[model samples]
Target chain A: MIHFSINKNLFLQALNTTKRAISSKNAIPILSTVKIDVTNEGITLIGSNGQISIENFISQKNEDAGLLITSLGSILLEASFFINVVSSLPDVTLDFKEIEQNQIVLTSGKSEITLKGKDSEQYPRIQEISASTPLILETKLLKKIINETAFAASTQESRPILTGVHFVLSQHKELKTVATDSHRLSQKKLTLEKNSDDFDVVIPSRSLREFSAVFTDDIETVEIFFANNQILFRSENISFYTRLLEGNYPDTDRLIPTDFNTTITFNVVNLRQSMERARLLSSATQNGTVKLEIKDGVVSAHVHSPEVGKVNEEIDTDQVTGEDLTISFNPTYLIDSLKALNSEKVTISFISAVRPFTLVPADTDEDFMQLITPVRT
Target chain B: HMIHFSINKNLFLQALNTTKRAISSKNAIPILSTVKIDVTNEGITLIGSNGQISIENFISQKNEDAGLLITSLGSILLEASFFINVVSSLPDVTLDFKEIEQNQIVLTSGKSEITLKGKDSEQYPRIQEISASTPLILETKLLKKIINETAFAASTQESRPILTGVHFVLSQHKELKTVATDSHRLSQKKLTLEKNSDDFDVVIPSRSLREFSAVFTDDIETVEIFFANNQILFRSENISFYTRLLEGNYPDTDRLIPTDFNTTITFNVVNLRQSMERARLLSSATQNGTVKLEIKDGVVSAHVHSPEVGKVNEEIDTDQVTGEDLTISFNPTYLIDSLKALNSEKVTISFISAVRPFTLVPADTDEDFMQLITPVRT
Candidate 1:
């Protein structure tokens, strides 16, 4: 039996964080519930979906929490249902307790709700990573790295490791994130404050995306802990744990071409809009090839779908060098790469019409690079 | 000889958006997916139809904003959504439209060119004409307000075809009234027209009226309602919207209101609404979402008890309470809607008994508005 009353807003805020780990589609009935464990220090809300677990703490020391603890125990309740009821409460604070066997009572204002609760013992054990030295990084930089690479990860289930963004950190704070789906590759490298621990792990693209969403814009720093099979991204009030893929990520170093026959620089936004228009005409041919011909000085994109329509757009460019070359590729791949490089100008270097090409921002030339394999006609 | 003309990209896009609503992607006839573009010296008219509804959006060349220049008179039928998509994404402000051949056209903007293949407008179905013998004119806002306040109560179920539409009738002088109900609850709203309109009785599909009202803004002064044997047209500046009338006589809702009241309670519209809000959330697990109202000793409370989830109870304040004590149960959905439709600060809810129907009316009214709801037996 546990009894407690806390500021309604504070409780709901912490519940949102834990709910990120609780997925409804997991079919396992127990995964649908959020475990509320109350102790003398504070209350802990835990949600797990076998693949990930998030523990959000409502600390008693935090004055904003206004936490009043009467008794200490634990209970599990359906997350979706509980969150809905709590959100509509007509009072400033809410009182909760497990009064009887698997029966919970919530009292707020002049209202009372009796909901069925489950014991928290059924929750699967969360794999705890034991590494002590935390690798520190600013939340913004980590989010940027993940956003820049995770999109290139394979969405298909054919290769499990290909669906993860391979994260490598060498001694002296060298961090590199690489993602490749055999067809396209994206990578970003940066240096952090010196740390003793070196790590090489593949994090699921989905987990990285969720982590980016969980941390608010205000939090500046986050600590990361890597273990054999599990990784944790911990902030001051919340801890995010996810299962790392077992297989090794493929080496994508050689996939990016070092030499090029033609290199052209264009405004990223201008080219992106042109690609969108070209893709519109190619919708009928879902897998249709888009060709870019660089001749004289102008670069024009040609997309012809005999039944639907045809589009010819001359993409504006500032600089054009090397020999004239024509390359065709999936428009979707180039459009996605262009959006990831938020830079105003991007230089796309092509080795030939058939070989893989590289895209790097005008400023962060060596720091960030994206490569796409061309379609051979 | 060919059809060639140029229109401002924004002007063309606006006309396309208006007509595109008539073409649903799930269309059966291939020709129905495209909108017919008829061009003349005066201007251009874009037409789209889905059999039940048709939209005729006209863009005039004389309008300075349209910037429509006619090089030659012609017509072509282009895919509604595709043309809208391509036109919206064009970079330039003005685009050139030219007929390439019998069944093909080209749209060029700046350095970009798009060759879209379309069909001849000859095959496009012609809009059936109608005679407006006695047209009724009403302020656009009045029509929009009546629709927003009543149409939602219409039955979404196909069980009763008549209930799926909102009933409307215009009396001799200026009384125009509309009512919609799904059998469980009912809403009746009335507006007085400035002009002595012709007396008419018809049921317009709630779905069609919703779309018609959604496209209106506060600027439009009035809409001319022209009725045919089996169709209705709502014409307003440059846009002619036509919808077939629903076939059925509306039920007699006049007798549904109770003449006598056993208990009546008045509360600030916001106060009573918030109390029902909590109980509604608790009953969301159920289909009908039954919530109970209890009034004893001048105190009002809303309660909901679901054996599976839980129960919620709240005591609401009352500005004025009278008559014998009573307890009633009903779904709070209708109550929420009734309060929302009323633009009043205070509302009075009158109940006949624990099992009968109840009515919610604004504090001040002259046979203008009334919402009736039936109680659910728990």
Candidate 2:
């Protein structure tokens, strides 16, 4: 039996952090449970998957304090249904008390439900990260870098290392994050003036994505630590950790074209319209290649598919430099890269036939670059 | 090249309503993807449809407040998309337009600008008009009710297209009855009318019945309906609607029922509800979505089961029960809809078969009626 109480909002916030810890697998009944423990200081909720475990702690606060611990004990309850029902209930003082030794009573104005719980020891344990030194960075900057770079990571299973975004922090002040999916590449440069040490690490893009959503605004600094082949990010009251891949990521710096033979600048809207029209006839599943033909001061887009007819559209370009060039690439990749691009005028630089190209804002101050490999017919 | 243009917000809104219904199916060729607008002294009418189903809403007088008048008389088949887009773009002002030619429509707002290219009206399909020999008076309210209750009962199968609409007859001033069936269960309703009229039996398309339901207004007392051999019309103030009728005679469903019921009961809804809930427990197949009703004395109860969950047992308190004690099995969906349509505090249910149709109604209100489904083989 266990009895505990905490501020409903604070408790929910902490639950969101560790909610992903709940096992999604139905094969193991015991693994799909949440272990809750209450102490004099606060209550702790732990969720564990076979590969990773997350722990969230809610403390008796200074401003928004709501904590009552009549007795301290532990119980593992079914995570999915319990969390769903709790979230749906009206906000009020939450009282989790034991009606019997094995059954727990949950009451919220008018609605009352009693669910069977198990001993906390039955839950699978996750290894804790112990480190003497932890690197700290501003939470907002970390989130921005994750968003800008993580999307480029390869989602395919062929390359495990490509699924992680490489983070190279030089003296803790300068960080360059890079991700490549073999087809496209995204890189972001961030400055952290506080840390004066250098470290290089690779964290899975998927895990960073989950952590990014639960991050809070109030917390400025996030402490990151690595131990026993696991990478952990600790912020405010939550701890997120995921296993690191064993292989090294490929060098992408040299792949970025330093110069271009044919370069064109166009308004984002015009380019977007031409691409959309051309894509109407292209198959959405396979490559969906649309060809861009550049001539004297104009760019024409054409798409053809055996099943669905064809479409041709022309849009004026701001400036088309160098000789005439025709290139074909996947329409989806171009569209996705354009959407991620943050600029009014996007510049596309092409080098040669059957080669990858880069799209960057015409302005120089933006510290982002996206590269895409053109499709070969 | 010069055409008279008047922008009326109400005219645009009406056109949008007709056009929206027309674009439900866009896989057709470009010609069938547009709403044809014919503007003349008779006011403006918007016609929209795919080849299978078509809809036309005629607005007789454009609201003068919105400045609705046409200078040039012509027709243009404009893509439904462009019509909706141009109208939505200018919500605050009247949209002025000029048909430069058969191929181009120049649309302008107070400041916003748009040019929509249209096809020649000659290329648009010619919708043949159906002439009615006799016209009947239908209460807009009553017509909406009959369609709402019985349309859901129609079979969605196109193999027998006639079964997809309610079999409706306008009996000269005696009754306006409509019936629809999909083999599983049947819904039939008869309303008394003040004036007697000639008998007409026709299958109104299920889609058309649904569209007519949307046009009903509570303030309007009645809508004039004209029936011909191939088409039907439901017309109200400033609005005229014509829908092609399904081309076959509906099955004679009157012979499917018994004149007398073996068991009769007046029940408060709660009696049958609890039974349905508990019966859901013992059945493995349907999750107790089907229940057996046994009526006797002043009590009516239901029982259902799903083998895994358990059993459901409910007893309904009724005012009176007379006639033979009988048990009939039926799908709960039909029962639920009938109960919801019941206008009185209690309902009167008559059962004549374990495998036949049953009649249900409010205890005192004869104005509203419903029929419950036949049970599939369990």
Candidate 3:
């Protein structure tokens, strides 16, 4: 038999972190419950799907007093049902006790709920991260890098490796992340202050998305440990693990053009508005393409649909140079990249009407770039 | 040839909203999507319809500066959805509308301009005129009360068409009563009138009353109701609404209510309403969908038991109970609906037997409103 008392707020926060890793529908019954382990140090909760696993700890000592244990043991309880009961109870201290073998009772004030617990012996053991030198970085900086590059990953199953983002870290402390779906590419690079050994890995975009949700800015530093086929991210209170994709990522360095035949600089806000208006008439049959034309000193965007009507709007350009050319591109791709950029003005460069173009912040020295292949009209 | 004028944006928006109700989505012909606009020396009139229902509104020059100026007198048909879209996009200013060449209409204000094509007025259908004597004049408040009390009993099934509206009557020139039923329950309400009139009976469609509510305001004192064989007209200051009447005689429901009762209980309306809502959770799987009620000296207890789900029992205090001990079962849904329609804090419930119908009325009121619900055997 086991018994304990835990503050409602602290327990709820721990459950939320582990609940994200639970699979909605699972073939293995043991994977549906969060594994609970109680010891002298504190209590730990573990939840996992086949691909991703998360373990969150609540220490007994801190600003807020944590869990108090009367007996020590381990058990597994259904996560979805358990969280629902806890959240609905009135705010107060809760008591949890194992009344009989494999049966647990939860009580708070006038409400009491009884749930059937499972034996912990059958639960699958998650592989631990091997002892090795880990890379330490700020939580805010890592979140920014993931947001800028993760959207370009392919959601289709044709090429499985392309669905993951390629992470490259050099001995000189230069870090770069890249993602591409053959139609568009987004790449962002930053310099790290802590020096670490060089390593490269392709992490699935879905795993990074779940990790980003639990990563909070309150935690100052996160230690990342890399293995042959697994990656581990450890924060002050949460530990996240994900499996790495096996195939090699393609070389995308040569895809960006260094020379340009036409370049136009415009305020990001003005261009986005004009593109939105022109996008109203774009249909799927035409790939939602909007045409952009550059001449003497003015630029205009236009879209024509046979079934619907037509819309054409003139945009103000700060400066125009190089050869005058007309081009077409997917407006959604351009809009997504522009939303991620943090700058007042953006510079767009094009080689020819058929080659790909790139967008970069005009005022910042950061090596952030987004490339899109123009549609042949 | 051209017609041009400027009007306030808010007034035009209100006219468009009133006209949109008559448009039917399933009409095969293109004319049904258009709203007819006629501009004359008096003012402007807008009309829309879908064969069964028609609505019209006129904005006169005296209302506010309705039509600032009229360059020419003409009429045209414009698509309803497209016109609304263009008008809503314009900034709130005096919008200038002009008819250019060949049926195209141009709307301009500030720097924005939109040109849409309009159809010739010759193809549109004209509004029909009804020649009948209207015998009823009711205050807007009285009409609103009758609609609220009786509309909920209307049957949604199409097998019985007469049950879809409250049966309205003007009796002895001093009493106005409305009653409706769907065969399972009935609600009746009566109000005193100052004037007497010739005996008249009509069943107005429930949907028409809902539409009429938007046209009446607190400031409007009276509504003139005109009735004919096929259509009924409800006219206010600037709006006119017509709806097709059901072509059958309404069933007489006065015999369903009982006069004497074996037990009488008075309880707080709010307490009973909350208990019935909680009992609804357990009635999902139980046949007959019945909730049991046990009445004692001064308290009433409600209980529900489902084999699969858990059971719930709750007790509520009552003001007084004057009768022998009694136990009864009823459909909780029916009780919930009846309680919601009552505006009284304390209500008296009259129960005749275990299987007979019961009545609920306000503890203190002279308006004479009663709701009868039949008991279900478990």
In terms of lDDT, which candidate is strongest? Answer: 1
Worst 10 residues of 3 chain B by lDDT: B307-316
Rank by lDDT (best first): 1, 3, 2
For model 1 chain A, the run of ten residues with the poorest summed lDDT:
A190-199
Candidate lDDT scores, in order, read 0.86, 0.70, 0.78
Residue-level lDDT for A10 in candidate 1 = 85
The best candidate in terms of TM-score: 1
After the best TM-score superposition of candidate 1, give how far the Cα of residue A154 lies from its true spot, in angstroms.
0.7
Which DockQ value does candidate 1 get?
0.68
Across residues B59-158, which tens digit of lDDT does each residue of candidate 2 receive? 5545565477778877887767656744564434576767874466666554333455677777878766657456678777777778777888888998
Candidate 3 local lDDT, B168-229, one digit each (tens): 88788777778988887788998777876666688888877776776566667888888877
| Of candidates 2 and 1, the better by DockQ | 1
Better of 1 and 2 by TM-score: 1
DockQ of each: 0.68, 0.06, 0.13
Q: What lDDT, from 0 to 1, does candidate 1 have?
A: 0.86
Clashing pairs in 3: B173-B196, B173-B197
When sorted by TM-score, best at the front, the candidate numbers are 1, 3, 2
Q: Which is better, 1 or 3, measured by DockQ?
A: 1
Clashes of each: 0, 27, 2
> Which stretches in model 3 have alpha-carbon errors above 4 Å?
A1-181, A184-253, A259-273, A284-288, A316-325, A334-353, A356-369, B1-153, B166-181, B184-229, B232-242, B258-282, B285-375
**Candidate 2 CAPRI classification by DockQ:** incorrect
lDDT of 1 by residue, B272-333 (tens): 77777777877877786888888888887878887767777777877899998889999887
